[PDB]
Amino acid sequence: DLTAFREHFAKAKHIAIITGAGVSAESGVPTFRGPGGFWRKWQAQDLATPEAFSRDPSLVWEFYHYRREVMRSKMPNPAHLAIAECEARLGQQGRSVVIITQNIDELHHRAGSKHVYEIHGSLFKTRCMSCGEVKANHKSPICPALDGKGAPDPNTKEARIPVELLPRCERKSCNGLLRPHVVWFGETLDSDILTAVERELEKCDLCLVVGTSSIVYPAAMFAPQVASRGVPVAEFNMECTPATQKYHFEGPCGSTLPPALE
Amino acid sequence: XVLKEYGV
Ligand SMILES: *C(=O)C[C@H](SCc1ccccc1)C(=O)O
Ligand SMILES: [Zn+2]
C-alpha cells in the first residue's frame, strides 16, 4: 500500500537508498550474470578476479573496455532520475538522501545524484597496480592499443595487447599498470566506505532497496542494521513475494519508483 | 574485510 509508504516519505529526514543491478539493467546495461549474460566464451565470474587479471590482463581490459564503451549509448532511466531529483528537492528542505549502490556504471552520477557511495567501485576509475592511486577516467578509448577492441562476439579474435601498452599510470616516476577500480570476486570491500555507510544507516529513518532484495548480498549487510532500529524498508524490484506475506512494490523501478518519490 | 558476495 503506497499511500502508507508516502506517509513515511513525507516525514523522513535521513533517507538511504540502496541500489542493485536491476536499475542498471533497466537502462540496458549488461550485467553478465545468470544464464544469457556472456561476453565471448565467458561470464563475469571468469574475468572479474585478480587471478584472471594476473593471468591475462589484455583479455580482462578488453572486457572492461567493452563495458566502458557500451555506456556511451545507455542512459539513466526514470528511477535514476527520480532518485536524483528527490535528493536535490529534499536537500533544499534540509532533509537528506544517500545512495549506496553496488553498480559500477556511474548512472547515478549521470542522473545528477551526488551523495552516492559506490561500494563495488567504478568502470570509470582506475587504480595503479604499482602506486595504488585512484583516478577518474572516461578517456574513450582508455588507451590507443584498445581502440575498437573488446568486441563481444564469441569467436572474435583476442587483441593480445602487450602489457606495456595497456593503460598505465600517468605519474612518469611510476608508469604502473592500471586496473579498473572495481571490486572483483574474492576481494574485500573498502573498509572506510563501509564505516561511512554504517554511519549513514544509523541516521537513516527510511530505507529503500531498488533493483535487488534485502535477502541477498549486499542489501543483507545493511537492511538488518536499519530494521533492528524499527525503521521502515521499501523494496522496489521485479521479484514476487508469496500471496500470504516491509513494503514491496513489484514491477520495474522505472515505473514503480517515480510515483513513490514525487 | 568483507569479502564480495560473502565469498559466494
Ligand atoms: C562484482 O560485483 C563483480 C563485478 S561488479 C558486477 C556488476 C556490475 C554492474 C552491474 C551488475 C553487476 C563485475 O562482474 O564486473
Ligand atoms: Zn602509479
Angle between helix A78-92 and helix A253-261 axes, rounded to 10 deg: 20
A170 contacts A160 by C-beta, under 8 angstroms:
no
Instruction: Report the C-alpha gap between A183 and A194 in whole angstroms.
Output: 13
**A111 Cβ inside 6 Å of ligand 1:** no
Q: Are residues A135 and A192 in the same domain?
A: no
Domains: count for chain A: 2
What domain range is A23 assigned to? 1-29+75-118+188-262
Which atom belonging to ligand 1 lies closest to the Cα atom of B4? 1
Cell numbers 569479502: residue: B3
Say if the Cβ atoms of B4 and A191 lie within 8 Å: no
Give the CATH number, domain containing residue A56: 3.30.1600.10
Q: Are residues A61 and A126 in the same domain?
A: yes
**Which long-range contacts does A41-44 make (Cβ < 8 Å, 24+ apart)?**
A41/A154, A44/A185
Experimental method of this PDB entry:
X-ray
Give the CATH number, domain containing residue A98: 3.40.50.1220
**A126 Cβ inside 6 Å of ligand 1:** no
Q: Whose Cα sits closest to atom 12 in ligand 1?
A: A31
Distance of CA A132 from the midpoint of ligand 2 (Å): 6
Name which of A154, A140, A178 is nearest A60 in CA terms.
Answer: A178
Residue A241: phi and psi, rounded to 5, are: -125, 140
- Cell numbers that stand for A211 in this block: 533493483
A211 contacts A237 by C-beta, under 8 angstroms:
yes
Angle at A256 between CA A251 and CA A257, to 5 degrees: 135
Angle at B7 between CA B2 and CA B8, to 5 degrees: 135
Q: Which of residues 105-144 of A touch B (CB under 8 A)?
A: 120
The total number of residues written for chain A in this structure = 262
Instruction: Report the C-alpha gap between A254 and A10 in whole angstroms.
Output: 21
Q: By a Cβ cutoff of 8 Å, what residues of chain B touch chain A?
A: 1-8
